[PDB]
Structure formats: C-alpha cells, structure tokens
C-alpha cells in the first residue's frame, strides 16, 4: 500500500500503520520515518584518524598530530577540515553510522609499561575496560558516590 | 503549499514554506542522498543489541563477545560487534545509521581490586556524562591538569 | 540515473549500476531505507547539549537538572532529556543519531587538586581526547594492556 500526495510519500505495511504510524516507511514535509526498520547503504562522510586521503593542507595542527599518530589510528575523526579550513568536513545535522561508532574512543597512557621498558598507551573504546591496579606499597580502590566513579590512592600497609 | 517533485534525480518535497536555503528545508531522496529538511529519521533502528540482551547466539560468538555478553559489569553497554552466522560477518554492517537508542548505551568499564571502605572488587559504567574522579588518599597526592592536549593525572607521595 | 515509484515504493538506480547487492540503489520500501552509499543530512536527533538555554528546569530530573548546571558538563550531549512526564525521553531510543550528536558525546575526569596549582581539577574526555597517568615523586605508574584489560598499575617507587 503506497501512496503519495503534496507531502510526500508513505508506505503502509501488509499488516498496519502501527500505533502512532510507527510502522510506516515514508518521507514527507514531516521528515523520515523508516517503520521500525533501517537506514542501510549510508555513511556519514566520516573518516578514521589514519585513513589515505586526508588533506594535511586544509588541516589544523592538533588534527593533523593525530591523524599521523598511530596511538590515534583507527579512532574516528569527528573533526576533519575542508576547503576554508574553518568549515567542518561533515556537518553537524548528519547522520551518523555504526561504523562511526565502532572508531569512537579515548587513547589511555602512561610513561612506562609494566615490566616493559617504553611508554604505553592504548585506545579505549567502547565495552574496553580500564583497571587501577593496586600495586607494591600502595592500595588502589574505587567506589561510585553519588555518581561519582571514584578511585582512592592511599598508603598499604 | 507543500509540493512533491519526481524527476530524472529523485523525490523532493517543498515545505508550505519554501525550498529554504540550499535545499535545507527541504525533504528528499535523491542520487545524492537524503534530505530530512532539518527535521528527524524517526521508528528507526540499527540493529544493535545491548550486552546481556536476548536472542544472543553463544555459538557464533568469539570469546570476547560471550564474555561480556554474560558478564553483568557489561550489562546494557551497546553490542557493536555481534556476529552472524558465518562468525565472521558483522551482524550490523559499518554503513548503517546508528540510533539515540545506540548512543545510550556507549561506554567502557572502570574497575579496581579493591572498593574503598569495602572487600570486594570494584566495577561501574562510564557512560556519555559520567564522571570519573581521581582522589588523594592518606599518604598520596593526586593532581590533574591538560598539558599539550592530555588530561594528565599525576601521583606523589604526600 | 532511474527514478520510479511504483507498488513497491521509491526505487532509483544509478546509471553505472545496482551493485553487489543493489547497495548503490537508492530506496524507500516496505524493508525500509537504502541510501545508495550517500549520506543522509540536514538532519537532527533533537539531542541539546547540556547548559543550552533551552532548557527547562520545571521538567527536569534530578540528575540532569545537576549537569545542565554543573559547568564542568557544559557542551557535553544531554542523552536525558525528559518532557513533561518526566517519565519519558523526549528523544526517543528509535531516533536516528547525528554527527553533531557524536560529537559532544564524553565523561568528566576530574580531581580534588590541580597539578602545580591549588584548585580543584576537571575537564572533559570527549572522542579522540588523551588521559595520561604519570608517575611523581615516590610512585610509579605504568600501563599494559592484559587479556583486553587497560591496566594502569600504582606502586612505591
């Protein structure tokens, strides 16, 4: 059941417009409604720290130290430049994908690894895990307190 | 006032007040995309699961996906890599739009071996709008500061 | 270049072709919504960010009415906005989410004191943002990532 008229375009399913028409597939001057189904085949024109054809030229510098550092690579880039260099590539009121939100995350480091000899750092992304481990002389504990995720420091023994 | 055009590039549709500026206001699926004229893509979703949601299948999971998926300190933290039946295929495909409902559930887990003033390990969700704290303890000083971009934390003894 | 609407709904297909799968076609049908590999914009989720002026205080819970004023939490995307019942969202979990949405997505870190200084300390970790943990006086603070674990471990030095 398909029809259009001066708004647009609506699509009934064999069964029903659902309650609140939510079960409806349609674009009209009210919007988009996809009835309870998906937006497939669609990117955001966002691209992952790392990727080939970034334009160093129209970049600032922040931008560019991350897209050249691989503690960075893989992470989405939500703020890449284009031409005037003041105008975001991809604009705010775009959709955004899952493949954006799989490249969302926050790099962790410290200047030593443990039992290692160099500095560490790695991506904290979603459903990754950060520990505070306790360690010789020193006990390291955590408690939520009125939200609050805390983690105390203090003195063993 | 509302019109619905079809020609050789796709469907748009002018709001009773016009075009607006650079077709912004206006509604349209066209060869070069979509158009919600300012406004939303509502009844959508992406196809994501919540970790601990059901219909999970345990057999075409790696082991870091069944984990969390049983694991309560993942519990409701979105899925963004279920599998499908060949075990390899993203369930989800990267090129699909996330929903509100996704973005809910984002967010990593912070633990500890020790709850303070308790006796058993510690573990929370840090969500988008959570905050984490890093606070001095009898003997140590702990500070923060952005230095060169990084949130830096430091630890002295006191 | 092949637009047509007929029982099935909106269907337009490129003059190059439909693809692996048609993942270049364009469509609008009862399976919902193929963007042909383009994006989707002009679009809005409806998310504020949190201390936008727009905001109402009347309606708000308890929680969200302590970020929307708590400065530390300024920018940051308010995923909790309630209506008039209070009891529900006013964005729905089946909006589709936007760059712009992405964008202020983070958490606070914070801490009672400010490194060489003598205030409190706090600052936002949105996408992409660095959390270094250092070593000081007397401690050593090393990383390793162990089993998928981001462990960041706190002994006498």
């Given amino acids: 059941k398909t029809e259009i008229n001066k708004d647009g375009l609506t699509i009934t399913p064999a069964n029903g417009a659902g309650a609140n028409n939510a079960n409806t597939i349609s674009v009209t001057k009210d919007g988009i409604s996809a009835g309870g189904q998906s ?10 720290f ?7 030229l129209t970049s ?36 955004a994908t899952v493949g954006d939100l799989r490249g969302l995350g926050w790099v962790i480091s410290a200047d030593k690894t443990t039992g290692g000899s160099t ?13 505070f481990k306790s360690g ?22």
């Avoid at 897209?67 to 430049?81: C, H, I, P, R």
């Avoid at 500095?119 to 459903?127: L, P």
Wanted: proline residues 2%; hydrophobic residues 30%.
């Fill in 136 to 157: 010789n002389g020193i006990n390291v504990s955590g408690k939520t307190v009125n939200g609050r995720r805390e983690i105390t420091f203090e003195l063993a023994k």
């Fill in 119 to 131: 500095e560490y750092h790695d991506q904290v992304r979603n459903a990754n895990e950060v520990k």
């Fill in 60 to 95: 600032s510098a922040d931008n560019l130290t991350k897209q050249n550092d691989d503690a960075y690579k893989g992470l989405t880039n939500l703020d890449e430049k284009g031409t005037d260099k003041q105008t975001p590539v991809v604009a705010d009121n775009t959709a």
């Fill in 39 to 48: 937006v497939k085949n669609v990117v955001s024109g966002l691209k992952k």
């Fill in 50 to 56: 790392g990727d080939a054809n970034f334009d160093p």
